[PDB]
Structures are given as structure tokens and as C-alpha cells.
Design an enzyme around this catalytic site. Structure first.
Site, mmCIF file in Angstrom:
data_model
loop_
_atom_site.group_PDB
_atom_site.id
_atom_site.type_symbol
_atom_site.label_atom_id
_atom_site.label_comp_id
_atom_site.label_asym_id
_atom_site.label_seq_id
_atom_site.Cartn_x
_atom_site.Cartn_y
_atom_site.Cartn_z
ATOM 1 N N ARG A 1 -10.561 1.404 3.716
ATOM 2 C CA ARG A 1 -9.644 2.070 2.786
ATOM 3 C C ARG A 1 -10.111 3.491 2.472
ATOM 4 N NH1 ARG A 1 -8.034 -2.020 4.086
ATOM 5 N NH2 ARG A 1 -7.435 -3.918 2.949
ATOM 6 N N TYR B 1 0.880 -1.184 0.000
ATOM 7 C CA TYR B 1 0.000 0.000 0.000
ATOM 8 C C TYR B 1 0.928 1.248 0.000
ATOM 9 C CZ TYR B 1 -3.703 -3.388 1.520
ATOM 10 O OH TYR B 1 -4.568 -4.437 1.660
HETATM 11 N N1 LIG Z 1 -12.864 -5.107 -4.875
HETATM 12 C C1 LIG Z 1 -11.795 -4.489 -5.394
HETATM 13 N N2 LIG Z 1 -10.582 -4.866 -5.030
HETATM 14 C C2 LIG Z 1 -9.619 -4.137 -5.646
HETATM 15 C C3 LIG Z 1 -9.764 -3.135 -6.575
HETATM 16 N N3 LIG Z 1 -8.523 -2.668 -7.005
HETATM 17 C C4 LIG Z 1 -7.670 -3.346 -6.289
HETATM 18 N N4 LIG Z 1 -8.262 -4.274 -5.463
HETATM 19 C C5 LIG Z 1 -7.496 -5.161 -4.599
HETATM 20 O O1 LIG Z 1 -7.505 -6.474 -5.126
HETATM 21 C C6 LIG Z 1 -8.028 -7.404 -4.145
HETATM 22 C C7 LIG Z 1 -8.868 -8.441 -4.864
HETATM 23 O O2 LIG Z 1 -8.977 -8.119 -6.239
HETATM 24 C C8 LIG Z 1 -8.802 -6.544 -3.161
HETATM 25 O O3 LIG Z 1 -8.797 -7.152 -1.883
HETATM 26 C C9 LIG Z 1 -8.021 -5.232 -3.172
HETATM 27 O O4 LIG Z 1 -6.918 -5.277 -2.310
HETATM 28 P P1 LIG Z 1 -6.992 -4.595 -0.886
HETATM 29 O O5 LIG Z 1 -7.513 -5.664 0.045
HETATM 30 O O6 LIG Z 1 -5.572 -4.180 -0.601
HETATM 31 O O7 LIG Z 1 -7.928 -3.421 -1.030
HETATM 32 C C10 LIG Z 1 -11.066 -2.751 -6.958
HETATM 33 O O8 LIG Z 1 -11.401 -1.888 -7.771
HETATM 34 N N5 LIG Z 1 -12.044 -3.492 -6.306
#
Ligand SMILES: Nc1nc2c(ncn2[C@@H]2O[C@H](CO)[C@@H](O)[C@H]2OP(=O)(O)O)c(=O)[nH]1
Ligand SMILES: [Ca+2]
Length: 104
Positions: free
Chosen positions: A77, A38
Site C-alpha cells: 500500500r 480503495y
Molecule cells: N493494520 C491496519 N489495517 C488498517 C488500518 N486502517 C485500515 N486498515 C484496514 O483494515 C484491515 C484490518 O483492520 C486491514 O487489512 C486494512 O485493510 P487493507 O487490507 O485494505 O489495507 C490501519 O491503520 N492498520
């Protein structure tokens, strides 16, 4: 009262602002934090209609009030962008799987 409610979690604007400042800061220098690196890009598989422009970057916001520097990122987030603009505050809490719902 809460400026943002992510499930049980109560955030004030001051909270959101502190996580957002860390996230854009790391983002400026090209540095990461945590095993999930992150801040990272937020795609918007969700389809939320952000008032703000793409592209987006997400960074954990902690219930403790502490700024994230590694370990469990928790469920909440803060979504910002290249202009350092708040897109919104989202959460995996109440969302199915790794999906996101918006904090109220
Ligand atoms: N649901 C979701 N997950 C995303 C997106 N872009 C990145 N992610 C990340 O990808 C993971 C599954 O696709 C999610 O848990 C999230 O990580 P984070 O848990 O760090 O937010 C988005 O647009 N939607
Ligand atoms: Ca707080």
C-alpha cells in the site's frame, strides 16, 4: 535498485507516484474501486511516525506495475493524505495477521 522494498517487491519512485496519483484522483471525486473500496482511510493502528499530517488514505500498489482497478489488491500500500503528500509505503508482508510493516 529499489526505492522501496516491500518484502520481495521492488518499487521505484515512479511506481509509488503512479499509484498515489490514482488514489488521490479517486479520492477527489469520491469514487472507489475493488470489493474493499480503495482508496480508504488508513487509521495507523501501527503508530508509525509519519512526517506528514493526518488524516491518511491508502491505495494498493501492484508488483506488476499496473495500476489497481479491482481484483487482488496484493500486500503493498501507498499512504498519502488530503494534501496529496506521500506518508509512506507499507505492507502486510512480514507483518502478523492484517498488521502492517513499513516498506524499506
Ligand atoms: N493494520 C491496519 N489495517 C488498517 C488500518 N486502517 C485500515 N486498515 C484496514 O483494515 C484491515 C484490518 O483492520 C486491514 O487489512 C486494512 O485493510 P487493507 O487490507 O485494505 O489495507 C490501519 O491503520 N492498520
Ligand atoms: Ca516498477
Amino acid at each position: 535498485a529499489c526505492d522501496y522494498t516491500c518484502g520481495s517487491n521492488c518499487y521505484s519512485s515512479s511506481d509509488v507516484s503512479t499509484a498515489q496519483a490514482a488514489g488521490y484522483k479517486l479520492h477527489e471525486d469520491g469514487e472507489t474501486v475493488g470489493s474493499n473500496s480503495y482508496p480508504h482511510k488508513y487509521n495507523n493502528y501501527e503508530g508509525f511516525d509519519f512526517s506528514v499530517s493526518s488524516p491518511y488514505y491508502e491505495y494498493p500498489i501492484l508488483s506488476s506495475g499496473d495500476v489497481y482497478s479491482g481484483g487482488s489488491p496484493g500486500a503493498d500500500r501507498v499512504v498519502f493524505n488530503e494534501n496529496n503528500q506521500l506518508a509512506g509505503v507499507i505492507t502486510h508482508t512480514g507483518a502478523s495477521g492484517n498488521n502492517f510493516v513499513e516498506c524499506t
